[PDB]
Design a binder for this molecule. Structure first.
Ligand SMILES: [Mg+2]
Length: 110
């Protein structure tokens, strides 16, 4: 079960990848906007966890890029936001607990 993790702060991205990994998913990492776009190919993300801001582009822009093609327009998008309208299907605040993330990712998968 493949989850694209778009997140520029490496320890957070690595934290998120470990939770998913230990929980039975196949996580894919992207450190910035460009790298995320180049992760939009076979094999395809079943859900995207999307950080709100990245080097080279925002989460709002990436969601627009997703909604522009039929292959990506349907992929679930959970926006990762920090504390302190958008097209995402759901949102989760940083820091979040590992059980919150999994439970959330599953409620969204459907
Ligand atoms: Mg960021």
């Amino acid at each position: 079960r493949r989850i694209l993790v778009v997140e520029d702060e490496a320890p957070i991205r690595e934290m998120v990848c470990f939770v998913l990994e230990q929980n039975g998913f196949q996580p894919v990492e992207a450190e910035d906007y460009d790298s995320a776009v180049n992760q939009l190919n076979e094999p395809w993300p079943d859900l995207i966890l999307l950080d709100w801001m990245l080097p080279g582009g925002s989460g709002i822009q990436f969601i627009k890029h997703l909604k522009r093609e039929s292959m990506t327009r349907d992929i679930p998008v959970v926006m990762l936001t920090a504390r302190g309208e958008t097209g995402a299907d759901d949102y989760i605040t940083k820091p979040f607990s590992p059980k919150e993330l999994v439970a959330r990712i599953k409620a969204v998968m459907r």
